[PDB]
From a paper:
Aconitase superfamily members catalyze the homologous isomerization of specific substrates by sequential dehydration and hydration and contain a [4Fe-4S] cluster. We herein elucidated the crystal structures of AcnXType-I from Agrobacterium tumefaciens (AtAcnX) and AcnXType-II from Thermococcus kodakarensis (TkAcnX) without a ligand and in complex with substrates.
The crystal structure was elucidated by the single-wavelength anomalous dispersion (SAD) method using the selenomethionine (SeMet)-substituted crystal, and subsequently refined to a resolution of 1.6 Å against the data set from the native crystal. Alternatively, we attempted to separately superimpose each domain of mAcn onto the crystal structure of AtAcnX, and found that domains 1–4 of AtAcnX each consisted of 157–336, 337–435, 436–569, and 1–149 residues in the order of 4-1-2-3, respectively, from the N to C terminus. Fe2 and Fe1 atoms were tetrahedrally coordinated by two bridging sulfide ions and two cysteine residues (Cys273 and Cys508) and by two bridging sulfide ions, one water molecule, and one cysteine (Cys510), respectively. The water molecule further formed hydrogen bonds with the side chains of Glu292 and Lys530. On the other hand, AtAcnX possessed Cys273 (yellow-green) at an equivalent position to His147 in mAcn, whereas no homologous cysteine residues to Cys358 were found in mAcn.
Numbering used by the authors: 11 to 569
Write the structure that this text describes.
């Protein structure tokens, strides 16, 4: 039995335990502390005050900001107990201790002690021990940093570059220490994700660092934000929400981040190349960068993305190291006849459920020749159910020939798994009032494909059709006529916002049920919006847009 202090602190409370990872953004409501992931075993449970046992986290990089907000409002669990490596929630609690004078203890157990303690009714944590129903286990103190540092690293840490840079380096070194890294690594560019207005604390952190003098040292793009930056006032977004959401975006721009406002930064001209070491947040962008581009970045939590951008340095750990990019589990995926575009997000979603805490190699799919957009949708869905920052697809992705670990296990995704996942993501009626496309932000080709399915037909008056995309794609779609073709059918194309960040009234208030082709939004949509969510192919979406009805049925390749 082994217990390891990750972040110090004292806590006591009832045990809240699960064997399935949870994403605090999208899966936990900062207003209540309740689990809102409708597909998680803990759905509906309030986490406030509990000692939360889960193997690790999954999903969104924004969990750090949601946990920070919960800590600040007193709605957070009293402690976190994992049994695997974890970064997102650990970083949120680390920022709480470093910058907000609040300690949330985080402990990692061995898997067997984890399972035993998860049966307990009550757990007490202090600096030296964890006790489950009185049964006490000694807790090893936080790991001591054994990092190789450059002279400029030490200069930043000593404060010779100011207090903001020192604070960033302090956080980077503490994260490297808990990961057991022995060095840092240069990054050529950053991508900031905490600009989504997921909680008041997201704004508080950004303005705190900006007022501290923080500024990025490497070129750094920005993920989606929670306002249509140029239009939210005219759209009728309430001032109480739009003003802090806009100020959150403004704070990162003031700190030198480029206002790309997109969750598909790999589509920008600034996209990194194969082998390039970058420092990115946003789970789908991280996974796409490693998986499809062959670039290298850990799945950095929100807030850590800014520290890495401020210093140009990240912990040399995880998939920055070649050994850690080798496939850790093999997945044979059934390839039925007659697949369409919906196959790829479904497979990514199921691949994450099958392999939630290590890097999988997906076999059996190379002959199907997935598009860049197919890989994009797959990676985004994989992020929702997994913690890993990358995956491999035999015959499709550039590093898929890396030798798997000699002890890799092999699992399957069967047709039966696919039918079950399809029905899980389709718990809603047939009548829909909204079609939601573009999580992550739509490519230009995805917009062209959508116009091709529409074939000049016009949406039903009672069905809104909304595509979220980055500004540069919308500009390009305006040039080549795709934007007008979509407008001709009644489709709205929105910049900056994504389905992760959209809000009423831009999200139409009349909506009761929506259909999406995003595996990611199919998962998060129910809890985020309170609406019933349907999941289908691009053409399933267009058919619903023209008729107002999404037929409830398994796809052709599953019947
Ligand atoms: S911001 Fe979440 S995928 Fe777009
Ligand atoms: Mg996710």
């Amino acid at each position: 039995p082994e217990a390891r202090s990750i972040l110090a602190g004292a806590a006591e409370g009832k045990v809240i335990a699960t064997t399935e990872a949870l994403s605090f953004w999208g899966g936990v409501d900062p207003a209540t502390g309740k689990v809102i992931d409708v597909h998680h075993p803990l759905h509906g449970i309030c986490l406030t005050g509990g000692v939360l046992f889960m193997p690790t986290s999954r999903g969104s990089c924004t969990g750090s900001g949601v946990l920070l907000d919960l800590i600040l409002t007193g709605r957070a669990p009293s402690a976190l107990v994992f049994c695997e490596a974890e970064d997102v929630l650990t970083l949120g609690a680390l920022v709480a201790a470093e910058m907000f004078d609040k300690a949330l203890p985080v402990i990692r157990l061995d898997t067997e002690t984890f399972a035993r303690f998860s049966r307990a009714a009550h757990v007490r944590i202090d600096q030296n021990t964890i006790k489950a129903d009185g049964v006490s286990l000694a807790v090893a103190p936080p790991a001591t940093a054994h990092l190789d540092l450059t002279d400029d690293d030490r200069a930043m840490l000593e404060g010779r570059d100011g207090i903001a840079v020192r604070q960033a380096m302090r956080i980077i070194v503490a994260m490297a220490a808990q990961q057991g890294a022995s060095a840092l690594v240069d990054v050529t560019q950053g991508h900031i994700d905490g600009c989504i207005y997921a909680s008041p604390a997201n704004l508080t952190f950004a303005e705190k660092m900006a007022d501290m003098g923080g500024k990025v040292r490497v070129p750094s793009t920005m993920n989606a934000i929670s306002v249509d930056k140029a239009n939210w006032r005219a759209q009728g977004v309430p001032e109480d929400f739009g003003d802090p959401a806009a100020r959150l975006a403004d704070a990162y721009v003031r700190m030198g981040c480029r206002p790309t406002f997109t969750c598909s930064p790999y589509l920008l001209d600034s996209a990194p190349s194969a082998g390039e070491s970058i420092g990115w947040a946003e789970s789908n962008a991280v996974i796409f960068a490693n998986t499809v581009l062959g670039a290298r970045t850990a799945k950095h939590p929100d807030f850590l993305d800014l520290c890495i951008a401020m210093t140009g340095r990240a912990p040399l750990s995880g998939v920055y190291l070649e050994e850690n990019r080798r496939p850790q589990r093999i997945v044979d995926v059934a390839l039925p006849a007659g697949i369409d575009d919906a196959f790829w997000p479904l497979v990514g979603y199921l691949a994450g459920k099958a392999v939630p805490d290590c890097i999988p190699l997906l076999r059996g799919l190379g002959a199907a020749k997935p598009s860049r957009d197919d890989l994009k949708a797959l990676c985004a869905a994989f992020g929702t159910t997994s913690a890993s920052p990358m995956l491999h697809i035999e015959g499709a992705t550039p590093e898929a020939g890396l030798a798997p670990l000699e002890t890799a296990e092999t699992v399957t995704i069967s047709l039966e798994d696919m039918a079950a996942g399809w029905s899980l993501l389709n718990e809603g009626p047939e009548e829909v009032q909204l079609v939601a496309i573009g999580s992550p932000h739509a490519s230009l080709e995805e917009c062209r494909a959508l116009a091709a399915v529409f074939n000049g037909r016009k949406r039903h008056a009672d069905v809104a059709v909304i595509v979220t995309a980055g500004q540069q794609v919308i500009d390009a779609a305006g040039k080549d006529g795709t934007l007008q073709s979509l407008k001709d059918s009644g489709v709205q194309v929105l910049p900056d916002l994504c389905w992760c960040s959209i809000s009423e009234p831009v999200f139409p208030t009349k909506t009761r049920a929506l259909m999406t082709n995003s595996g990611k939004y199919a998962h998060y949509g129910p809890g985020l919006s309170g609406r019933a969510v349907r999941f289908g192919s691009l053409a399933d979406c267009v058919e619903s847009a023209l008729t107002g009805r999404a037929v409830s049925r398994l796809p052709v390749w599953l019947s």
